[PDB]
């Protein structure tokens, strides 16, 4: 009922408070600037 992860071909579901990423893609994002 939500939205997939913003990243490439990610199998997981994103979330607004993570700029649209799943939790780990979001940490990856964050770690890279």
């Amino acid at each position: 009922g939500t939205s997939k992860c913003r990243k490439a071909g990610c199998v997981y579901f994103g979330t607004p408070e993570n700029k649209g990423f799943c939790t780990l893609c979001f940490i990856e994002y964050r770690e890279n600037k």
Partner: protein, 73 residues
């Protein structure tokens, strides 16, 4: 929010959770309500086994969803 955890035996358990909770957070909540070691726990959602370090939302698990508890034992 809140979800249901169901053993194979039949025994059901209701858990109060947030979509932010990791699979470890949930295994921990079960160890509380049922004294099972999280290393024995294998959680399953709609046929997929839930991988450690990911969250409920990563799986699109929403309120009133049902996970099954399998055990390594």
């Amino acid at each position: 929010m809140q979800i249901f955890v169901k053993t194979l035996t039949g025994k059901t358990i209701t858990l109060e959770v947030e979509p932010s909770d990791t699979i470890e957070n949930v295994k921990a909540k079960i160890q509380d309500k049922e004294g099972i070691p999280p290393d024995q726990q294998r959680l399953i959602f709609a046929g997929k086994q839930l991988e450690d370090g990911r969250t409920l939302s990563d799986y699109n698990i929403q309120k009133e969803s049902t996970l099954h508890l399998v055990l390594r034992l």
